[model samples]
Target: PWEECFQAAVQLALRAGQIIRKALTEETKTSAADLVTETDHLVEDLIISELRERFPSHRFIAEEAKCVLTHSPTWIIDPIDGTCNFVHRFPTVAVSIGFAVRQELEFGVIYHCTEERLYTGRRGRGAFCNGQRLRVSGETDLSKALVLTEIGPKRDPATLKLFLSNMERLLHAKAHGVRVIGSSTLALCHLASGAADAYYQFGLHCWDLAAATVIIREAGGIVIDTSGGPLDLMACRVVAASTREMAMLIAQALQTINY
Candidate 1:
């Protein structure tokens, strides 16, 4: 059952966190904005090796690597969720892993290595952070919500203008505040932890949202397409909020790009 994988992931994430804690003092980059480091690969290998021994038959889909999701057990992982923040020692890096079986999410484990916050979500169970239970805030007013998003890698003139316009819409809706924290996983974790009321982002992969989606939903939050449909991990976009009211409000306020 998922208990074994869940427990194993918890311990492995802690081990992985210890490594990132040390590695924060090191790195290299993939782009001026996108960063990758030896530590990312090192952590991926470390987690992969440990889990590989215990779950040899399981599939893997990682940020540094991949395999398809099937009816069999599968792990969706991103060894380092905030490479850019890790590079700048920005204090929000994470090791994210999600487990699925029968092609549905079973559980998730995400360790905020920098912050020493461990988040877990077990289907039919609940969500937690550092062993404490988590739940999204009971807020429903869109104008009173704290919103979260990310400024993605794209910087073309049109995308930039569109991005600004979306941000402007949030402000116009009178959202309490809007934040762009570099780590999407951590932002979702925070939402699960009830620190934020809404989150909407464009262009994210399965590895980035897989674990966080479980955490957020299990914590009594709503996760849906940026266009307000069902959650599509493959589509690379999402909107999460404490309530459908807030999620719908946020979705209608933004203009999505075709990227």
Candidate 2:
């Protein structure tokens, strides 16, 4: 039998996702960084409301206008993970929900609205996609595997200018080309599902990767801070990959050049 809390979360997020899909064509109520959509707020409100009603004392950290809730059992939510893609109807958005007890992520659930796929993970129990068990791809060669990457809405021009200066070197190394999907949740889910071998991102908020981190790790992948250290929920720089070789290559690329 499924844990009551997990079952409830899945149900709530699914309901919220339906709302998001319905509001896809709605006019934008806000705008930021090549992205705008009122659905983000609508879905977030739906999820938070449901969670609050069920566990009033549980905290919430959501991307919408909710205050950061600080408590042992906190929920992290990203109503529309790919706002830019969503606003433009690019069919890459997702609903991300993560549970953390005392700051340690207990599990992650991501619903790709466009694809109608649910990726979930419960700590120590492994991960799954749409009721099927999932695992990272067996390919360990970094140069041979496809890599994904992203720079968030708050990309620092100077920082990126510096970083790109170095990224050019890697691009020339014959490694798989880099692809950036506006949604971190989708990118992370791709990693979990073996659709992509690795993801390296800079300047993301906790809401962006909180749930996806658990999903990726539980799916037999690894996530690390940009410094090649333990994953930090509060930090924006992160790298997720199938194997140590992938992580090591990314870490070296992130450190090698003066970015």
Candidate 3:
């Protein structure tokens, strides 16, 4: 059943990639630095329709619509994971889809539309990108690790400054570097693929991190709530790293910051 669901998710995500690419030329802004193209809704609707036809009893939690979390089998989706990047004509955006049963993620697929790179993960099976297996980097030292962080849509000047100060501290601590790539899903995928050693973000939705959560875990990485506890997929801050030592290091560093 999981394999069936995984195949469906992969097909839907690839279909969404085409829709996303075609809509890039005419994205509509929902707010400053936030965007939603007609394609987003179109893709979601298409995915939901097909999923509903195939699995009538399944539920859905998607970015375009606000729905309560259910204990039943569910599909969590972000039609366009990096709408800002999509609107700005950046190539870092993706279509992310995840499937969960009893509120636990079992499989996920993320399609980086611009590059046509497909990342997939099934619980206990393994993680893969474009048919190649993925493994997180073996780096354990935070000082030499490349970290990824994000500033959500919050515009508070003080909050922004505080986060910037934290970034400065991370650099001062001798982290290899930091990147704000504007896509949590892609960031996690990069971590899963061993391109980045760690990732942290405040204010992420279940739909934002659900897919990548499974991917990271399957890729020999660890993901935890920012409080250094189990991740709550519905809504919570998240910190993920290639190894437990690195995760603890990043969590401790983040705890010292005011923001």
Candidate 4:
């Protein structure tokens, strides 16, 4: 059943990708640092409609719409993960779709529209990117890890200062480097495929991290709250890493610094 669901998700993501590639000329400002295009709504509607037709009782949660999470099966979607990038015709956007049953993530699919790559994962199975099996990097040393992070839509001076303070700590920790890719979904996918060693951020929505959560876990990585506790998708501040040792190191370092 998960396989069937996974296939459906992938199909929907691919279709969404086609629409996304053609929407470069259309965008509307949603916030100071956020943008949305007609394609976003169109894609969400298409996926929700198709999936609903297949699973009439399933619920839907998406970026454009606010829906409560319940015990029932739900499809989580981010029609355009990197709206800013998409608006700028930057080729780092993606369409993310994930399925959860009883609040447990079962399968996920993320399509990198620009690269024409697909990343998928099914719980208890494994993760794959463009049909190639994925695995997190084996790097455990903080000094040698390539970390990924992002600043959220909140851009208050105090908020910006806090994020910069934490970033300075990471730089002092001598991480190989830190990158702030606009898309959290692609950041996790890169981690899953061994492109990066760790990722962390604050103020992310469920749709931002849900699909990628399963991919990271299946790729032999760990996702946890910033305090090293369990990850709460509903209210998330995540620190995901290639291994537990690296995860602990990042979490501990991040927790020590006051934000």
User: Judged by TM-score, which candidate is best?
Assistant: 1
In candidate 4, how many clashes are counted?
Answer: 0
Instruction: Let me know the TM-score candidate 1 reaches against the reference structure.
Output: 0.93
Residue 219, candidate 2: C-alpha displacement in angstroms: 0.9
lDDT of 2 by residue, 75-97 (tens): 88888787777766778888988
- Candidate 3: stretches off by over 4 Å: 25-36, 256-259
Give candidate 1 regions above 4 Å deviation: 26-36
State TM-scores per candidate: 0.93, 0.88, 0.92, 0.93
Candidate 4 lDDT, 134-226, residue by residue in tens: 998978999999999888888788677878888888888989999987999999999989999999988777897889999999999999888
Of the two candidates 2 and 3, the one with more favorable lDDT, higher being better, is 3
Task: Please list the C-alpha lDDT of all candidates, in the order they appear.
Answer: 0.84, 0.76, 0.84, 0.85
Summarize candidate 1's per-residue lDDT along 23-47 as a digit string, tens digits: 6665435442343467788888988
Task: State the displacement of the C-alpha of residue 89, model 2, in Å, after optimal TM-score superposition.
Answer: 1.0
Candidate 1 global lDDT: 0.84
Checking candidate 3 for backbone clashes, the offending pairs are: none
lDDT of 3 by residue, 70-89 (tens): 77989999888887777778
The superposed Cα distance between candidate 2 and the true structure at residue 65, in angstroms, equals 3.8
- Listed per candidate, the RMSD to the true structure in angstroms reads 2.4, 3.4, 2.7, 2.8
- Which residue runs of candidate 2 sit more than 4 Å off their true CA positions? 25-36, 66-71, 255-259
